[PDB]
Design a protein around this ligand. Sequence first.
Ligand SMILES: [Mg+2]
Ligand SMILES: [Mg+2]
Ligand SMILES: [Mg+2]
Ligand SMILES: [Mg+2]
Ligand SMILES: [Mg+2]
Ligand SMILES: [Mg+2]
Ligand SMILES: [Mg+2]
Ligand SMILES: [Mg+2]
Ligand SMILES: [Mg+2]
Ligand SMILES: [Mg+2]
Ligand SMILES: [Mg+2]
Ligand SMILES: [Mg+2]
Ligand SMILES: [Mg+2]
Ligand SMILES: [Mg+2]
Ligand SMILES: [Mg+2]
Ligand SMILES: [Mg+2]
Ligand SMILES: [Mg+2]
Ligand SMILES: [Mg+2]
Ligand SMILES: [Mg+2]
Ligand SMILES: [Mg+2]
Ligand SMILES: [Mg+2]
Ligand SMILES: [Mg+2]
Ligand SMILES: [Mg+2]
Ligand SMILES: [Mg+2]
Ligand SMILES: [Mg+2]
Ligand SMILES: [Mg+2]
Ligand SMILES: [Mg+2]
Ligand SMILES: [Mg+2]
Ligand SMILES: [Mg+2]
Lengths: 119, 62, 152
Amino acid sequence: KVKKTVVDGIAHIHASFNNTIVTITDRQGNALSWATSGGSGFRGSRKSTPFAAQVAAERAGQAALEYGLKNLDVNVKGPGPGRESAVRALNACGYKIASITDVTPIPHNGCRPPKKRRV
Amino acid sequence: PAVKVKENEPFDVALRRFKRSCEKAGVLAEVRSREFYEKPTAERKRKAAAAVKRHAKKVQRE
Amino acid sequence: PRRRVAAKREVLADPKYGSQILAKFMNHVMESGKKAVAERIVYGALDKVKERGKADPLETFEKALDAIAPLVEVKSRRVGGATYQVPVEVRPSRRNALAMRWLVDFARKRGEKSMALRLAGELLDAAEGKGAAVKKREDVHRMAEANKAFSH
RNA sequence: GAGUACGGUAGAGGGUGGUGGAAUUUCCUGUGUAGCGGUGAAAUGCGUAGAUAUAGGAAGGAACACCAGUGGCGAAGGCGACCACCUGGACUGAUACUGACACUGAGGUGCGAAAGCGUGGGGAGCAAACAGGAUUAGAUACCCUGGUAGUCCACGCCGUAAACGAUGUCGACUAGCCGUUGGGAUCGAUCUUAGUGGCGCAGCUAACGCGAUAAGUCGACCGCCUGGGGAGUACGGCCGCAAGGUUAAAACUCAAAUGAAUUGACGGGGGCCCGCACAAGCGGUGGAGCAUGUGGUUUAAUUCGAAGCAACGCGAAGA
Ligand SMILES: [Mg+2]
Ligand SMILES: [Mg+2]
Ligand SMILES: [Mg+2]
Ligand SMILES: [Mg+2]
Ligand SMILES: [Mg+2]
Ligand SMILES: [Mg+2]
Ligand SMILES: [Mg+2]
Ligand SMILES: [Mg+2]
Ligand SMILES: [Mg+2]
Ligand SMILES: [Mg+2]
Ligand SMILES: [Mg+2]
Ligand SMILES: [Mg+2]
Ligand SMILES: [Mg+2]
Ligand SMILES: [Mg+2]
Ligand SMILES: [Mg+2]
Ligand SMILES: [Mg+2]
Ligand SMILES: [Mg+2]
Ligand SMILES: [Mg+2]
Ligand SMILES: [Mg+2]
Ligand SMILES: [Mg+2]
Ligand SMILES: [Mg+2]
Ligand SMILES: [Mg+2]
Ligand SMILES: [Mg+2]
Ligand SMILES: [Mg+2]
Ligand SMILES: [Mg+2]
Ligand SMILES: [Mg+2]
Ligand SMILES: [Mg+2]
Ligand SMILES: [Mg+2]
Ligand SMILES: [Mg+2]
């Protein structure tokens, strides 16, 4: 029942080798709409494709169109596929993109990663 | 790895410029480097092999 | 095959309608070298179509083919643990032959009296798009679109 | 030859304190809603008791992206965040000084990766043992989800590694070419010095290969070898808290074991190419009845022969 209005939001794309997660929020970091590849009906080896990321980005954008949101900045994070299909789907939704940034976290020395797989 | 869209250029120039900046920053290489633990023996072996190939290629140019 | 040496063979011998597609369909319905029997079957089916309704048989046949030729097809490729079924746009030459083959195949199992009448029924059904052949076509399309994540 | 005194350089050489930034994990809170995670595919597992995602705050531990390089330092093992303090060696230039003061080294003494052991702290990530899920004929494994000692620190022990350049230390001579590290000179160039790499003439080697950083030509001293197993094992001695370490045989058994290279064959190695080899199609066999050859069985005899592809409508184009 309750509604709200907001413009000039921020879209976070979280790519990985298995799944991608799209989340539109306002500038303060409060989520409005979100969509994934597993929630778009792929569920497996098809979940890890740029097509699934495109579908997820369009679905999330159509969900977030309720608030208005005529401006979006973009934050990409992850090595997986769909690192760019989501970004090209977001403008196809009808948005205007102020900028794009990459916020992938890189340790400087950090903790040690797991063992190497013997396949 | 951060670009801006300035003075109404199409959203194909901006995306390719973003890709070029990401490639220049070596993001994906850094992410692939730290996926698993590479024991120091393997790291030294990789460095030695890279040096051998580099020197051989540089010598072959003349 | 590897050589890519055999070009196509052209035969165009429609005896009484002057259509290439009719001759190709006569080739498809032929079995064991009975050219004339196939011509009689096709002509009987077209005459039944002409008699049933005011529609002329040639246009009905053509627009029945246009309502049955598929648009995309499924081709399988293995990756070492699973075989994915990628979609490919059927070539403009393959669609006609596939449509003809499907039409004659589902005509052969229609179940009514004679082959001429079976073809007649299949053409009437396909001109409106309600036979089993159109069910197969839409099944192929839905399978192909359900595997659109591969596409490339 | 070997050392001393005096300026100056380069350095992840060592030890004791302090401080940074990135990231992970846990905890608290706001937004928000149905998935997350994982895989060759899955499942175990995590979520509507509100997860994943996103934003703000806090705690704690460990490892120091880029620079980074066939780079540097160290007797070796080894040493990568920054700053201060204590400290060892090397390189470099001139003058002066001592006057063979040197090399090697059985015993002996000391340093010595990782794992491991004892006492006391610490606990993020990872991860032997362990548990569950898959795979499989089975799977005490590879793969997935978790996870304890350990990995970190102080003190003490252990004293072993493919601890390797598989090459003991010291000194003298022997064509050259191209890099690079720390310095000197002379006019970017030439010369020279101590390291670190790639080629290469002689010479050497069974060959591969080495070749001024020799495996070349010569000196000084030390260690070690004498066919493969049994065996670096048994017993004794000495070390250790324990794991164990070190010194170290015999009977018996075999006639070989081994190094380098050549030809072929092969590979769940690589690169090209072809063939009804796949892919796109048409018609069949396997089911029925009969014909015919074979196996087996039966018989007095069911006469011999052909046996994956390359035997079975085959010798037989006529019991
Ligand atoms: Mg894994
Ligand atoms: Mg969170
Ligand atoms: Mg946070
Ligand atoms: Mg000693
Ligand atoms: Mg240790
Ligand atoms: Mg221990
Ligand atoms: Mg123990
Ligand atoms: Mg212990
Ligand atoms: Mg303890
Ligand atoms: Mg775990
Ligand atoms: Mg301990
Ligand atoms: Mg030894
Ligand atoms: Mg040795
Ligand atoms: Mg020597
Ligand atoms: Mg020496
Ligand atoms: Mg020597
Ligand atoms: Mg010498
Ligand atoms: Mg050489
Ligand atoms: Mg020799
Ligand atoms: Mg012996
Ligand atoms: Mg012993
Ligand atoms: Mg003993
Ligand atoms: Mg004990
Ligand atoms: Mg050999
Ligand atoms: Mg071969
Ligand atoms: Mg076939
Ligand atoms: Mg049969
Ligand atoms: Mg016989
Ligand atoms: Mg025959």
